[PDB]
Assembly symmetry: D2
Homo-oligomer: 308 residues x 4
Amino acid sequence: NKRPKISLIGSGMIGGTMAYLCALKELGDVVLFDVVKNMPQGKALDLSHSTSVADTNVKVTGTNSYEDIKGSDVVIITAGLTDLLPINAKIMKEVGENIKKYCPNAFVICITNPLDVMVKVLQEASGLPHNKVCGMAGVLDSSRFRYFIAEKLNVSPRDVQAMVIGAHGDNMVPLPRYVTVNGIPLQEFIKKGWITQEEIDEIVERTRNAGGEIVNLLGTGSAYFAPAASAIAMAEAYLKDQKRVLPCSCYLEGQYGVKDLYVGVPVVIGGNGVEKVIELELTPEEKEMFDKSIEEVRELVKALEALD
Amino acid sequence: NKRPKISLIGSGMIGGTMAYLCALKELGDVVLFDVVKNMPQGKALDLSHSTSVADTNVKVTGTNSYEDIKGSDVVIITAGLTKVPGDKEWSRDDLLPINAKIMKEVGENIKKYCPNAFVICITNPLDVMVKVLQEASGLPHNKVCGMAGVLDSSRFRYFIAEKLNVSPRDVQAMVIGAHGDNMVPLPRYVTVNGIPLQEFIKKGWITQEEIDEIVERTRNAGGEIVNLLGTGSAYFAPAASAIAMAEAYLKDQKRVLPCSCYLEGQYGVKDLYVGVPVVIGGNGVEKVIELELTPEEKEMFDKSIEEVRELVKALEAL
Amino acid sequence: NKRPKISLIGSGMIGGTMAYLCALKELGDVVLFDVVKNMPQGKALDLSHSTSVADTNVKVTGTNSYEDIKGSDVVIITAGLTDLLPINAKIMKEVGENIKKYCPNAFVICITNPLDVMVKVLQEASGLPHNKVCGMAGVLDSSRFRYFIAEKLNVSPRDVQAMVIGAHGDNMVPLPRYVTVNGIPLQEFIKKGWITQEEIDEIVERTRNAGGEIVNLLGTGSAYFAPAASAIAMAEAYLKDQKRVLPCSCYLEGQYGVKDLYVGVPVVIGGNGVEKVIELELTPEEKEMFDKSIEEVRELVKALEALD
Amino acid sequence: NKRPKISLIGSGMIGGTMAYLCALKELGDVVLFDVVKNMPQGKALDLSHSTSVADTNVKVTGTNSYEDIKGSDVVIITAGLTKVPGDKEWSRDDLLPINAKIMKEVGENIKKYCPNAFVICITNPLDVMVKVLQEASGLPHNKVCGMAGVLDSSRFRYFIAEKLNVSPRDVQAMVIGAHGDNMVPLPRYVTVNGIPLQEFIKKGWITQEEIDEIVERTRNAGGEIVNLLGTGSAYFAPAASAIAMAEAYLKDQKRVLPCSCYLEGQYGVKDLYVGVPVVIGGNGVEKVIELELTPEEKEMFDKSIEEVRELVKALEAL
């Protein structure tokens, strides 16, 4: 009888934040992996002490050896640099191989950028079902779209439904049309004077650039509280079979007119992985932005294939 | 400084459930009031024991005296008769007239001991008893509401989630109007994380007749459970619904929730409590949302408010 | 890939309260079993609706057929009457058999009274390891001892350690000597004037009679919020391998001078069940009260053996 | 009505961690202050995003201005220099003199903008900087404390639990005195759900040398982590420790926690802040617990308070 095992491939800012979350939520034993010697082990000691304050029994361990990931139920990958593409492609290939050897039945959540591109390399090097490999981005872009909308309307973000599909990047595709307040079309709140069409346009673009906005303010580093919470919600939805509807980068085999690619779309995450891809009724205009956003992904996936 | 004070008027199965939720969530001190001597004191002692299992400091007290609700930040009222005996004459010469008179003494005790409290009614005919409680207490209309939509919507949402095999958390579903057979669920506003439910009809997750049956099963959900229970009524979802409202107030969460609130022109209703989607915050019912209802939906709604009007008229007669 | 399954044998007051807890805590899917037709099914509908308010995906089902318990990870038993002994012994025998057929790898928590007696009958009829069958009582008696102490000192019960060993009943054995405030001997707070020796004596006896006190106040029925929370903490400690130190009725094979009996003593509950029995340094006076408390249990276990 | 206001003075790794804990636990509105321009504003925006993942309404703001702490119900202070550079001369002519002067401006801003707030210090030499902050702010001594014991005890407890293979929740372990090498962990008061740890020595769960090593590893825990990290210090357990104290106040939990508090005769200490087991409640440090320390333990303690005295004397000189 075994506790769920959650391995974080990469013990940087996002990685360590995800470990704290896993410990605060007693999701499972946490393994922080990193190539930098000692550092993960030091974060793990800090986190282990934090459990005494949370009155939990969570085992958190740091390591520099991939062998410690054997039997992981969930793996979340932030390892990489933020000529970056061939480097990260090399690392993700190495991560994918180690996963296939040590924990091939794991559910795998990629975060390393360019997200959608690196997701497919991971799957290819890993060989696991396309159903149990995915990338976090849409949940993050959605949480920002949701937050910005929620702030202007002055309602809880819980009651704001918003989504971002396509690729993680400046050409991500926020969908103002599908935004709702507890299922009420956002258009209704324009008519009632809660928000104007211009402010929605601005929030849509602010959602597109939100990462850069944080990066500019932080001065040194990118966002990580929300990136981490996003990947952990995906991990929570898998481990507790919550069947949550979330935008994630997932393998498509015809939906939205894409084949053999990981792209950001709404899915149902459950105990078996990405159990259902949801096919939105995009308008022509929305399909086009989606097709332009994933252009870069198609080409880079094809370029990196050529270079192996 | 002081912890928030939550008083539960009526210590039946719902009241005890709400107290257990409040202790579990460490929302504040809890006061269990009831007319039955000693019983509230027994439930408080049981719950006090449980805070040890929950490693919480929550104070839970039982009492047969209104003086102990002094300074309640939130009052939640389950006292009175229930629909269970429904005897077609029960609604008319028992439930309605008796509960109205209890709502008055309850309102007077609130006005005397905790006039600054947010008041959440549950006793039925809810939309009516909320009016009575409000008038008897003289409290601001936005600080007195009724729980019904949250519960009706919790069922509407559950049935929807169950068929689609997604979490109820991404099913947005609302029930507006009056609590009871006149309630108006809104299939057209149901969404799966903002996606209209129509999209899942066409993509085969759901048929519209199933949606129509779910609308009806939502209307009859209480009676379905009662008939199954043999004794009593549902109390778990009624309790969590009222506490979610109470939590939205105590923590200023600005949650969108269908609640029985005072309309002052919205939806064409004037000076009357009825179920509408509202924002609950630290200052109570802070905003009524006026949905762009179709005429069909608005007719359904107006008919729902008319039956509410009749019963407040009949009660105002005596 | 499967969600934890928790079956409640008995859907009465305690049983239903335990189901709510399981749903509030997303511990697993809950199966409420009862011999009374429809009633459990009705409580389950009520609880299923409660999940929409808690924004969870917990599946809660009611049933009148034992076949629905197959594959349960945890079973908690309240079925019975509150000539009661031969009746409950018959029921517990039936429960135990059904468990052995349908879910023999389950962790089993008994609550039906006389607790310690009914625990052994269950194990005998069930055949499962003595390690994965136990009874809840000490956690409940301890939570009352802890609460009463905490009230007089005006500290959080979290910071009060107190224990009750022996049999569930009027001769339960509260241990004032081992009571601590965050590990500080309670004796120290006598010397400082926080509590007197007489008040401790009174709390010890009030702990002994606490069930009856509630029963007298409730007028109709016995306690159940705390009984339920107690059994669920034991269940939580097993399902999440929390390794919690708790007084429970557990099989002894020499510890405390008892063999082939379930008695209330401190144990470590983990993912493998009752992983460790803790052997307190009882004084002679404490050993004696322990021996007198379990006298009734020894005899009734022997009497019921004779009658099979 | 208003949500509780929590201001974090210093938005480093600890401060950001505390803000994430406060948002996760919906304890109140959060104000991240720092001297670094824009950085607090960046962390607040990241955290604001996260409330969407947590389905919470928590307001998190970043600021480089003290005026925005107006009305804080709790202030938690991490600003200043850290031990990381420790350069044997760092403690004496940098850490001590520089942090004292920041604690004064921090204290003055508190006195002007939120004098009714519960103040939790973290900056080191903690026991000393707590005195400075208190004197500079003029706040009641029981409304200004320092976090150290909780963290030191969280480590003491973890190491103990780990060896015994039980949950840290049933290991009661306390560290008293000053934070730093002079801290005094108390192996004699350690218990496993009230059972003296001596009982587990004899029954073979633990050896006393292991207990002695764990006492030492507890003293050196910070430096152990720093040496492993390469860059920086621990921040996860420091953060949860201060928030547990802040939670005990905001929710009047009456938790027993070793905290750096003002002694007025207890333990033989007069007019001085040091680490003692205390009760934290809605009114702050409500009661100091005077343990029946053995002479050996009391000598250890007095030596710990003397080093604290020296550094407050040296700082008071200038």
